[PDB]
Design an enzyme around this catalytic site. Structure first.
Site, PDB file in Angstrom:
ATOM      1  N   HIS A   1      67.239  16.818 -36.080  1.00  0.00           N
ATOM      2  CA  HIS A   1      66.584  17.030 -34.796  1.00  0.00           C
ATOM      3  C   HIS A   1      66.069  15.793 -34.067  1.00  0.00           C
ATOM      4  O   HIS A   1      65.899  14.704 -34.640  1.00  0.00           O
ATOM      5  CB  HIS A   1      65.400  17.994 -34.951  1.00  0.00           C
TER       6      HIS A   1
ATOM      7  N   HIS B   1      62.904  14.510 -32.435  1.00  0.00           N
ATOM      8  CA  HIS B   1      61.476  14.820 -32.381  1.00  0.00           C
ATOM      9  C   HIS B   1      60.899  14.140 -31.147  1.00  0.00           C
ATOM     10  O   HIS B   1      61.465  13.170 -30.644  1.00  0.00           O
ATOM     11  CB  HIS B   1      60.764  14.377 -33.665  1.00  0.00           C
TER      12      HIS B   1
ATOM     13  N   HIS C   1      59.432  18.728 -33.008  1.00  0.00           N
ATOM     14  CA  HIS C   1      60.727  18.745 -32.370  1.00  0.00           C
ATOM     15  C   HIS C   1      60.510  18.626 -30.865  1.00  0.00           C
ATOM     16  O   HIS C   1      59.595  19.235 -30.318  1.00  0.00           O
ATOM     17  CB  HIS C   1      61.458  20.064 -32.698  1.00  0.00           C
TER      18      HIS C   1
ATOM     19  N   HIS D   1      61.668  27.494 -32.033  1.00  0.00           N
ATOM     20  CA  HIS D   1      62.717  26.752 -32.720  1.00  0.00           C
ATOM     21  C   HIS D   1      63.973  27.622 -32.817  1.00  0.00           C
ATOM     22  O   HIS D   1      63.888  28.833 -32.946  1.00  0.00           O
ATOM     23  CB  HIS D   1      62.256  26.357 -34.128  1.00  0.00           C
TER      24      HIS D   1
ATOM     25  N   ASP E   1      66.730  20.496 -30.861  1.00  0.00           N
ATOM     26  CA  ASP E   1      67.316  21.261 -31.973  1.00  0.00           C
ATOM     27  C   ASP E   1      68.823  21.089 -32.097  1.00  0.00           C
ATOM     28  O   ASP E   1      69.586  21.744 -31.392  1.00  0.00           O
ATOM     29  CB  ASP E   1      67.010  22.759 -31.836  1.00  0.00           C
TER      30      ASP E   1
ATOM     31  N   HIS F   1      66.555  15.741 -41.961  1.00  0.00           N
ATOM     32  CA  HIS F   1      65.609  16.380 -42.874  1.00  0.00           C
ATOM     33  C   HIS F   1      66.074  16.572 -44.322  1.00  0.00           C
ATOM     34  O   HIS F   1      67.226  16.309 -44.657  1.00  0.00           O
ATOM     35  CB  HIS F   1      65.139  17.702 -42.260  1.00  0.00           C
TER      36      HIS F   1
HETATM   37 ZN   LIG Z   1      63.064  22.892 -33.312  1.00  0.00          ZN
END
Ligand SMILES: [Zn+2]
Ligand SMILES: [Zn+2]
Lengths: 152, 152
Positions: free
Chosen positions: B45, B47, B62, B70, B82, B119
């Site tokens: 993502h 951020h 995000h 989300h 996203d 992530h």
């Molecule tokens: Zn998100």
């Protein structure tokens, strides 16, 4: 509006530089601390690209949207990214504190997404008498850099 | 218009992600690779803040300028930042190839100057059942990130 930048290099130079611009057309306060620098003056510039793929080298030249010659911050003839010199003390620390009205955190002169670079030597502010002077100020190699990002 | 991002972290995760957008109102191509990832799916993502003063931790949530829940990249109800998941193969390498039409390299959905984060766990694209899903997709910690910068 606020931006921030973490300065890193191959050597020991590193630091965090903060950017703040209260008014959309107001000056930008640039402040922070850089350590591991040799006592004396060091060129301080916003370079064109926020590209760190090949270290500070891939940052390109001084951000120069108006295609002008290199100068010192006070000069009318200067690159948008020409912030002059920062000074490191005998302890190898430069307590940066600059206020500039040519760079911006929005619009044509926005420096967000570009690279802040602290150089090896003093920026001659374009008064060195040669092509190099009016191109890079003869500030030498790039000791540390970072991409300028949006902050809160 | 192009951008690039060098992802780094405290661990072995590292990579380079490219971004291209031929038309201001067109989609953004996103590609490159990330190594050091355990085989599997990984949350990917943009951020909000391009602030790496505290590593990836200072990046914030995000990028969500429209204040929506989300979701997965193809969901109407998503965070602009996203981008779903990337896939690391058995050699701990994720070859990224994405095309998105929500994110932009300009305008109000501009991600330049913000942080790209890879992530720990897979992003459940917001269909996980608990609150944390419609917020972070349960993608776990941030293994590596970088500020997105303008590229030549
Ligand atoms: Zn998100
Ligand atoms: Zn210059």
């Amino acid at each position: 509006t606020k931006a921030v930048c973490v300065l890193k290099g191959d050597g020991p130079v590193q630091g965090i530089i903060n950017f703040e611009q209260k008014e959309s057309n107001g000056p930008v306060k640039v402040w922070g601390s850089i350590k591991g620098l040799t006592e004396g003056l060091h060129g301080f510039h916003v370079h064109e690209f926020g590209d760190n793929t090949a270290g500070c080298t891939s940052a390109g030249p001084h951000f120069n949207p108006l295609s002008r010659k290199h100068g010192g911050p006070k000069d009318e003839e200067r690159h948008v990214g020409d912030l002059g010199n920062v000074t490191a003390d005998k302890d190898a620390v430069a307590d940066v504190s600059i206020e500039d009205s040519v760079i911006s955190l929005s619009g044509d002169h926005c420096i967000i997404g570009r690279t802040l670079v602290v150089h090896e030597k003093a920026d001659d502010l374009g008064k060195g008498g040669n092509e190099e002077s009016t191109k890079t100020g003869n500030a030498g190699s790039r000791l540390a850099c970072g991409v300028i990002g949006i902050a809160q």
